[PDB]
Design an enzyme around this catalytic site. Structure first.
Site, short mmCIF file in Angstrom:
data_model
loop_
_atom_site.label_atom_id
_atom_site.label_comp_id
_atom_site.label_asym_id
_atom_site.label_seq_id
_atom_site.Cartn_x
_atom_site.Cartn_y
_atom_site.Cartn_z
N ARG A 35 -34.76 -16.18 11.71
CA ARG A 35 -35.57 -16.76 12.49
C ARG A 35 -35.93 -18.26 11.93
NH1 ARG A 35 -38.00 -13.04 16.23
NH2 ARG A 35 -39.81 -14.29 16.24
N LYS A 94 -40.09 -20.23 24.27
CA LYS A 94 -39.15 -19.67 25.19
C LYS A 94 -37.68 -20.32 25.38
CE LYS A 94 -41.98 -16.59 27.36
NZ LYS A 94 -42.90 -16.59 26.16
N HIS A 141 -48.30 -9.41 15.05
CA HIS A 141 -47.71 -10.07 14.31
C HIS A 141 -48.17 -11.54 14.40
CE1 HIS A 141 -45.19 -12.79 16.91
NE2 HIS A 141 -44.78 -11.41 17.65
N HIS A 152 -43.65 -12.02 10.93
CA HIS A 152 -42.98 -11.10 11.30
C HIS A 152 -42.39 -10.25 10.00
CE1 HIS A 152 -42.25 -11.25 15.56
NE2 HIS A 152 -41.90 -12.45 15.48
N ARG A 168 -35.29 -16.14 5.91
CA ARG A 168 -33.87 -16.44 5.93
C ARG A 168 -33.10 -15.20 6.16
NH1 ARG A 168 -30.91 -21.41 4.93
NH2 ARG A 168 -32.26 -23.30 4.57
N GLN A 223 -32.52 -4.88 26.21
CA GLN A 223 -32.71 -3.69 26.88
C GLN A 223 -31.45 -2.87 26.71
OE1 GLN A 223 -36.15 -2.27 27.56
NE2 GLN A 223 -36.28 -4.10 26.23
N1 LIG Z 1 -34.84 -29.25 1.69
C1 LIG Z 1 -34.43 -28.51 2.46
N2 LIG Z 1 -33.18 -28.86 2.87
C2 LIG Z 1 -32.27 -28.30 3.68
C3 LIG Z 1 -32.62 -26.94 3.95
N3 LIG Z 1 -31.81 -26.11 4.84
C4 LIG Z 1 -30.88 -27.09 5.09
N4 LIG Z 1 -31.09 -28.19 4.23
C5 LIG Z 1 -30.21 -29.41 4.28
O1 LIG Z 1 -29.68 -29.41 2.69
C6 LIG Z 1 -29.78 -30.97 2.23
C7 LIG Z 1 -30.03 -31.00 0.87
O2 LIG Z 1 -30.49 -32.35 0.49
P1 LIG Z 1 -31.76 -32.44 -0.44
O3 LIG Z 1 -32.88 -31.55 -0.47
O4 LIG Z 1 -32.67 -33.82 0.08
O5 LIG Z 1 -31.12 -32.55 -1.89
P2 LIG Z 1 -30.03 -33.76 -2.13
O6 LIG Z 1 -29.21 -33.73 -0.92
O7 LIG Z 1 -29.41 -33.78 -3.65
O8 LIG Z 1 -30.65 -35.14 -2.46
P3 LIG Z 1 -32.30 -35.16 -2.97
O9 LIG Z 1 -33.24 -35.47 -2.05
O10 LIG Z 1 -32.48 -36.55 -3.81
O11 LIG Z 1 -32.51 -34.14 -3.95
C8 LIG Z 1 -30.90 -31.44 3.18
O12 LIG Z 1 -30.58 -32.94 3.36
C9 LIG Z 1 -30.78 -30.91 4.36
O13 LIG Z 1 -30.34 -31.51 5.57
C10 LIG Z 1 -34.10 -26.47 3.52
O14 LIG Z 1 -34.18 -25.35 3.89
N5 LIG Z 1 -34.74 -27.36 2.88
FE LIG Z 2 -40.87 -17.61 18.57
#
Ligand SMILES: Nc1nc2c(ncn2[C@@H]2O[C@H](COP(=O)(O)OP(=O)(O)OP(=O)(O)O)[C@@H](O)[C@H]2O)c(=O)[nH]1
Ligand SMILES: [Fe+3]
Ligand SMILES: Nc1nc2c(ncn2[C@@H]2O[C@H](COP(=O)(O)OP(=O)(O)OP(=O)(O)O)[C@@H](O)[C@H]2O)c(=O)[nH]1
Ligand SMILES: Nc1nc2c(ncn2[C@@H]2O[C@H](COP(=O)(O)OP(=O)(O)OP(=O)(O)O)[C@@H](O)[C@H]2O)c(=O)[nH]1
Ligand SMILES: Nc1nc2c(ncn2[C@@H]2O[C@H](COP(=O)(O)OP(=O)(O)OP(=O)(O)O)[C@@H](O)[C@H]2O)c(=O)[nH]1
Ligand SMILES: Nc1ncnc2c1ncn2[C@H]1C[C@H](O)[C@@H](COP(=O)(O)OP(=O)(O)OP(=O)(O)O)O1
Ligand SMILES: Nc1ncnc2c1ncn2[C@H]1C[C@H](O)[C@@H](COP(=O)(O)OP(=O)(O)OP(=O)(O)O)O1
Ligand SMILES: Nc1ccn([C@H]2C[C@H](O)[C@@H](COP(=O)(O)OP(=O)(O)OP(=O)(O)O)O2)c(=O)n1
Ligand SMILES: Nc1ccn([C@H]2C[C@H](O)[C@@H](COP(=O)(O)OP(=O)(O)OP(=O)(O)O)O2)c(=O)n1
Ligand SMILES: [Fe+3]
Ligand SMILES: [Fe+3]
Ligand SMILES: [Fe+3]
Ligand SMILES: [Mg+2]
Ligand SMILES: [Mg+2]
Lengths: 416, 457, 457, 417
Positions: free
Chosen positions: D51, D192, D120, D97, D32, D255
């Site tokens: 990324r 790509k 990488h 990376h 991140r 570039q």
């Molecule tokens: N787990 C996870 N969720 C992400 C990430 N980036 C964005 N999200 C979003 O953030 C939301 C967080 O929800 P959850 O991780 O399920 O937690 P919650 O909404 O409190 O519900 P629970 O699953 O019961 O814990 C997810 O539904 C994803 O859609 C990531 O890197 N990891």
């Molecule tokens: Fe790539």
């Protein structure tokens, strides 16, 4: 006062009071019912737009471009008169089109009356002359400080071409005549406008951004002749714009089904000629293939003719009704093959009618049993701006198609 | 045999061979020349889309939604035949529209034949039945395995209401099919999403609702011994926002002042010229414009052409209609006088419209005016702004389910959602217009309108 | 000499040489490392834009609006000096924001030092003063005709406000200039449109407001011995749509439960990690994170690098903070219990926030649970959501004009617009979170929460 | 249960629980804080993405494409196991990376340690191995019917090169799988499309390519007794348009002049900062920035925060890097000395990067030059476009050096012919 009108492509547009006064007239509103692509509606259901918004957008682009160019170089002494004149010229740049725009001018008139040289732009200028004469706009033009006598010509030569034959504006302002219609380049506000509209409605993503081109427009003297150009780093912009032009043409403007549909429409129109009476000036009645010589009759000539032929019941239009029903039933003819246009020579417009006779009269060499006359073959010329020729046959039988293939291949080699 | 078509809103659509056979018939192709918005073109020059694309998009959306629901829950026992029937029903949901879409069945029909009440739904029903009967689609339908006797009635009952469990096309264990294309228990259906997308794409306005999320959060569970479609309990705000978007579109584009004026002018032009028109029907018979609704073959030839055909008319009998249409062309429109504080504590009925101009003329202003008007010099129009259920709350009739128990349906009331929602759910507007354009006439009309409003709630 | 910048939202941005001189300064390029939505980047994976382009867009929009107002009315004696002043003032309207934008000044500072009132606007003002005092920009300002004595005071006034009529930078006849970048009267400015567009583009949610229409109908007319910006009388619906869109975007993205809980736990980690992080200040001194507001030199180097520095540090003195951040990384967040209903018939004041954990712990459930929960395991959140005026209707303070009277101001109340407008403008929300993770703990927390909610009405 | 995540490019996405488990680990969550375009953010203020979303989109696109291919051709006998393998491998194709994802491997490592080969992709594969080993992912991988031993090798071969049939993960029947995540045959793969679309969206330029059309018209047929992906013959123009878009993107954004000089100067700053900062590693050891790749437990601690650490550090030993970064932040960048005519061979080898700055200083132009400039004032830049192109930069900004520097460059190019 000022009036505001929106548009899908551009944002809110401002309109001069004289421009709106010109707009509200039956002759100009006639564009309300002419499709931009013409016969392309039957292949791409997204091409449902008319020429009205196209003209409005072209006028807006011309006005904005000229205003921006004059703003950053106040030493050219460009007055409001020039802006109004160029905007008006751009607004009425496509008044001459008939039904379905291109096809009527490019396939019908040269076939119905070969001996007459006609182009939709000449019709457009004739229509503009009739419009200005018939609605008494000249006093209004004089009211806003615009001189009618010289500016009417100015516009006339701005829309069409006249060692300097121009007689509207002296040489010190020779850069104006290439804004709406550029002879030596072919790229103008109309080009960008109709590109943007076509890609937006068809669904093809665009690549050009005319706002940048406006942002980098400068004028300087070249060979005692003021010219407009952009900075040298817009090569990528130009290349991608030209690539978009080529892709658009190849994908849409030369689609097989659209062109054969246009062929069917024009065949139905010509077969139905000499039976439709259209009121004209002084009560004179004209045919659809003859109305081009008068404007009172041409005013009431729009896309409605096709529908009128479709929903008529007179026994004299049986063949036209049958053809229109066939297109509606998607029983569409057949494509045979493609030509080899080699010679630098170009097939003259009035030579199309000979082509079916030539192909039919050609003697095939391969073993062919069925002999077909000259009334069961259709050939069309596509102007790639190269010239392309396509062939179509009345019959749909596989055996008939095989014979048609032999006639075309022998004739194509015969004509080099 | 598979075919592909492009749209400017969605991607590339796919049609079953039966859909290909149905689409390419004169009855369906008639829609190619009917403007979607109708009288709104003359104000928004980008609204140049007909009903053909709308029908195609609605069909595609219905097919995609049913496919997604079948995929999520394989236990529902949903076969290809069900999907095909739903798709076909969705395709032909707007066949009955007349010229200028809502023109014909909202302003002309009530004024030409006030003895009948006709809506485009049963007109589309009749058109579809005539299409099937006349184009001989039954043998192909049988060849593809679909059963005509039951499925045709199923489709017909889908386009319209039921005409205690009244439905008979399909059993009760498939009752969630009757709320995909046209929904009466609530306004949720593909048609809304499709026309939202197309109208906001063409007009030039920005939309807020997206249907992909709702399709992704779809499930079916039994409610009151009935299978229905429920949404997750956290999407109530989304539905409220979507209905607010509907109201915003209606207030912004569909009910523009000039749009309604051009609507009424075209209605008057049609009304004043119907006797001197003949449309060939079955067996060579002829019908008037108003009476054409009772013969389907004569009705098929009724499209937007009539407008310009009257515009291009030459017989002396159509002089008044031609004059009105040319008055439109010169953009010499009726001048708007003034709106009034929304209604009051009453609700003007449907049959009381003709009285309002008489009331306005009967109004006696306090200040003497140099111009005296008559009863026919005023036009009064009433607009019904609501959320689609005439003062009821649409959300209350929607079933919600929770993540903890994905097989239980609960109903969320108004107080459990927020406190920033409208108190009412419908209001009525009063518009007054004058047919004169002189300044003195406008002054007199304004004075009379103020007098009448002061003598009203 | 005018530079050009490519902005993915707008077109090409043109900058005066003084503006580009201001841009390229450490105290400004600091803003390249301050995320706009704070913790929202961990729930919406498309929101990573910083404050730099946001400030650029705000400046560009202010320039465009002032240019349009000058063009449509050349009688206001508007000059290039005022345009430059407005542009520079708007380009640096959010300098004082700390890490993660609103989190620092909303959750962190109130707890660390509850004995001092601090709003990020004052921080921005003092940071701008530091810029001017350190970078020696006064000579270049003078070289372009700007008189610092009045111009800098006017720019300061445009950010916070006053410091009869309290303003001193400009005379009364230019009073409308103060409502362009940040409006205190009704709350309409370029910032709103800028961040609406940017957030709706980056997040993936379609917007609903187009500012082009508003600027098109923009005008200035006298209002009570004072010039003000007024809109056309036909634009009320679009203003209400703007406010509704703002509230909807708030409830949809800016107050997501996961975002708020992540922000709260990060603030807890920061508070626990205090008294062990040293940042060099003026004269080689050392300042704590909570005390870093007295000296702007120390405050300059306070960005989101602190988050990763604490996360990745091997110092044994920050083990608790490292563990908390490793937990937030592992997606072992605090669980969600429930949300009460609006208690907004009588609001909850700020100073009572810390009591709610004690109140919820002290509530006695009727059903007996083996596990006992204390007041240290419950996190309480309070959300203030409204139109930004605390029950005051913003539209009531906006002046309107009619087409036939372009130099007269009339006020439109709520009734004359529509009866579908919301009845309540502001309200309050409450949440409760259980730190523990086991199922029994969540069950007990839910029982406690329902008991407390029923107890407090 | 399955999860839904919103992406402003592909919209809502459907995530398998195993991929959710993989995501929630530090080795992946660290991405991140790495900018996709590296130094490009200082020229185009709209490219602030990292990324993470690129990896998510690549995984989703690979999964969707393989799902469609299986749906429209059931004769290939494709099971969910291979689909999951491809999805995870695509999700973890950009894990190794370093900072900026192109400055490090592009210029930094080949200079500081010019005797160790490093791509990488190798770092990505080894870090993936470490991630699977150090988080107990084997039991979960076993839970969902996915055989670990063969599938880990399959994923490795998918990420890194193949290493008559050289592959081992699957036999020749499923020989078209290896071309999805990484297409070495023709150069078309979901990566790509994903990064093209993301860059075009964020920069503010309109791209006309449509991958959904290709997915619709794509299929696999037996060619030369093996399975390769083939498409219809009517979309040649579409592919050429996509190639045009790729060329335009490369020539317009990747570039850009100021971005390139910024990246080079940042590399110089990091090089100087080396030997002064230590990154804690496995077993409590300490590793240097250049040597941080040897033990990837420490490499997990290398993010974009190094830039801020160097900028805000107060150690007197980092003075030179401090004012270099301050010059970056003051807009006082290096000046464009010249542009090379890279005709002949001009194929700079990876091991000779450090030699070129010394060689350019050794040129003797045929002009009077009183001032003397040392090789450290001359910076040599090598970038491969697919052609090779070279440029030089001068640290000094005085006018006299600008004139003097030009003579050496033209002399060296003449010397190199
Ligand atoms: N787990 C996870 N969720 C992400 C990430 N980036 C964005 N999200 C979003 O953030 C939301 C967080 O929800 P959850 O991780 O399920 O937690 P919650 O909404 O409190 O519900 P629970 O699953 O019961 O814990 C997810 O539904 C994803 O859609 C990531 O890197 N990891
Ligand atoms: Fe790539
Ligand atoms: N049938 C049909 N096609 C349409 C319509 N609108 C657009 N199209 C497109 O236009 C194309 C041309 O249709 P056809 O004349 O049948 O040509 P074709 O698609 O190659 O089908 P065949 O000629 O039978 O081989 C179709 O493939 C459609 O994708 C429509 O209203 N009806
Ligand atoms: N005049 C005109 N307006 C059009 C046209 N197409 C769309 N419009 C829109 O329709 C609206 C009609 O407004 P007006 O013609 O000014 O009539 P009005 O609303 O009564 O306003 P006034 O002319 O001041 O009386 C305009 O504001 C345009 O934006 C067109 O072709 N001509
Ligand atoms: N000045 C400036 N430019 C930026 C910034 N961020 C991105 N840019 C872009 O980066 C480009 C490089 O600007 P310069 O550093 O002046 O490079 P240059 O244009 O070759 O140098 P000059 O010709 O003197 O302007 C600018 O044209 C901007 O479009 C910024 O923060 N400040
Ligand atoms: N809220 C809106 N959003 C977008 N476009 C709109 C909106 N209202 C109107 N338009 C379109 C309709 C026309 O295309 C153009 C002019 O509309 P509008 O401002 O209502 O003019 P008008 O002619 O009705 O009023 P006026 O009496 O001010 O001349 O803008
Ligand atoms: N209103 C919204 N519109 C569009 N996308 C949204 C909206 N709210 C959230 N998202 C995005 C955020 C994430 O990318 C994805 C999941 O969000 P959301 O459905 O709110 O999950 P959640 O965390 O509230 O619940 P759960 O854990 O039960 O799935 O959708
Ligand atoms: N006052 C109105 C209402 C709607 N429309 C048009 C705009 C839409 O393009 C079309 C919608 O078509 P449908 O009737 O099939 O869709 P709905 O189900 O939403 O219509 P309704 O809710 O009125 O039954 O109607 C209109 O012209 N004027
Ligand atoms: N949880 C969040 C997330 C987003 N915002 C940010 C985004 C908005 O642009 C801004 C709110 O706008 P306001 O009108 O309330 O005041 P501003 O914060 O925009 O003023 P300033 O420009 O000084 O930041 O704060 C917020 O308030 N809190
Ligand atoms: Fe044109
Ligand atoms: Fe519909
Ligand atoms: Fe802001
Ligand atoms: Mg008007
Ligand atoms: Mg969750």
């Amino acid at each position: 006062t000022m009036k505001v009108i929106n548009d899908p492509i551009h944002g809110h547009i401002e309109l001069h009071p004289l421009l709106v006064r010109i707009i509200d007239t039956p002759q100009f509103q006639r564009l309300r019912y002419i499709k931009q692509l013409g016969g392309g509606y039957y292949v791409f259901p997204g091409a449902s737009h008319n020429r009205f918004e196209h003209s409005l957008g072209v006028g807006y682009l011309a006005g904005c471009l000229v205003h921006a160019l004059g703003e950053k170089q106040p030493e050219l002494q460009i007055s409001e008169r020039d802006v109004l004149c160029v905007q008006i010229a751009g607004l009425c740049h496509d008044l001459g089109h008939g039904p379905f725009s291109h096809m009527f001018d490019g396939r019908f008139i040269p076939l119905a009356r070969p001996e007459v040289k006609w182009t939709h732009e000449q019709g457009s200028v004739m229509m503009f002359e009739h419009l200005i004469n018939s609605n008494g706009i000249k006093p209004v033009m004089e009211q806003y400080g615009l001189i009618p006598e010289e500016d009417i010509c100015f516009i006339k030569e701005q829309i069409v071409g006249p060692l300097w034959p121009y007689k509207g504006r002296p040489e010190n302002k020779s850069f104006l005549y290439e804004i709406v219609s550029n002879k030596r380049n072919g790229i103008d506000v109309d080009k960008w406008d109709y590109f943007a509209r076509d890609c937006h409605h068809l669904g093809i993503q665009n690549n050009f951004d005319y706002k940048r081109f406006i942002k980098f427009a400068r004028v300087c003297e070249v060979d005692n002749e003021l010219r407009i150009c952009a900075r040298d780093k817009e090569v990528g912009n130009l290349y991608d714009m030209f690539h978009t032009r080529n892709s658009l043409h190849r994908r849409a403007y030369q689609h097989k089904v659209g062109n054969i549909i246009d062929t069917m429409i024009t065949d139905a129109f010509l077969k139905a000629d000499d039976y439709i009476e259209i009121t004209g000036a002084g009560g004179k009645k004209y045919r659809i293939s003859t109305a081009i010589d008068d404007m009172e009759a041409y005013t009431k000539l729009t896309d409605n003719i096709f529908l009128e032929i479709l929903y008529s019941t007179d026994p004299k239009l049986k063949d036209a009704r049958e053809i229109l029903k066939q297109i509606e039933y998607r029983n569409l003819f057949k494509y045979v093959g493609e030509t080899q246009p080699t010679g630098q020579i170009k097939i003259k417009r009035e030579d199309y009618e000979s082509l079916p006779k030539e192909v039919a009269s050609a003697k095939p060499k391969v073993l062919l049993d069925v002999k077909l006359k000259a009334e069961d073959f259709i050939v069309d010329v596509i102007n790639m701006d190269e010239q392309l020729i396509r062939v179509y046959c009345k019959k749909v039988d596989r055996k008939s198609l095989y014979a048609a293939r032999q006639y075309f291949v022998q004739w194509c080699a015969d004509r080099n």
